Design a protein that fits this description.
Helix content is about 30%, strand content about 20%. It is of the alpha+beta class. The protein has 2 domains: about 140 residues, 3-Layer(aba) Sandwich (D-Maltodextrin-Binding Protein, domain 2), CATH 3.40.190; about 160 residues, D-Maltodextrin-Binding Protein, domain 2 (3-Layer(aba) Sandwich), CATH 3.40.190. Strands 6, 7, 8, 9, 10, 11 and 12 form a 7-stranded mixed sheet that branches. Strands 3, 4, 5, 13 and 14 form a 5-stranded antiparallel sheet that branches. The protein has a two-stranded parallel sheet with strand order 1-2. The longest helix has 16 residues. The termini are far apart. Bound molecules: fe (iii) ion (FE). The site of fe (iii) ion has 5 residues, from α4. Belongs to the transferrin family.
Length: about 325
Amino acid sequence: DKTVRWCAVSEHEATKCQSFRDHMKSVIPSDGPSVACVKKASYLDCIRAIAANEADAVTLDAGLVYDAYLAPNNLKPVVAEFYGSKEDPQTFYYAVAVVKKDSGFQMNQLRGKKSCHTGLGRSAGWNIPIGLLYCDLPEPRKPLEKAVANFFSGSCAPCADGTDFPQLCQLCPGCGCSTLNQYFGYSGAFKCLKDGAGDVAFVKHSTIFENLANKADRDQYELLCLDNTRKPVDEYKDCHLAQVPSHTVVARSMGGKEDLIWELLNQAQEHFGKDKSKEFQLFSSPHGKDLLFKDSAHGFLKVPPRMDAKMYLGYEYVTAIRNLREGTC
Ligand SMILES: [Fe+3]
């Protein structure tokens, strides 16, 4: 079988997936890999669809690769994004806290603010900033959601349960887990800050550059540094919360079609990759940012075949995510 069933998360992704499928048909020979689109309501539905042999591939933030590995889904990373450039491929990025200039507060003054997160469980939007915060609370509210809900004065945490924790959806009611939620993802969390809904956006170092083309506009923003100071958004290298690994395509650990997923993706970056074509762009869309893959990605690299999720993420990140979810301090 030469079809890779790609899992698209809701409507904008499904639109781009269809364009992906149709543009690959225009350049890959008829005996080559083809794209079929499967649409689901959230990454987690895609994880389950893949484990159940209803879909083959989906791209996940590395924090979500954790959930993807857990039994009984047992998926594995097979193809990783890289950032930066072909010339120096980065398989990491920086988690940063973006704030508006002249809002005055520092990192130790986040209590009571309104917070914009990319989504529950994601590296920059959640695992890093909450992972740094949780234990350092004097309060054992500590199985996360309730503790974060009380610490901030209202949030948008896409994919959180708004019935159980309404505070975490105050800025984005329903906490929708797809780009139909306008405050989902890196650029949704940035808009949440830009719009004045929240006081801080937990996103990545490219995010503000993806959204504000003009240096004068960007000058109205700053980064919160862990030593309770602020720096210009250009100085993320010296002012970030953490470095985290690349988003990656996951697949079944057995019968995953990983070899065919690589073939589809490699041939796709060849024809429609970074600045390759004006007919189609793997890495951007008129339909939204970060659909199917990150806009900030410049291409794909194959994951070594021995490497399971825990090896991909590494010991410190797997341990932190495990500890963060158990509230162990
Ligand atoms: Fe991410």
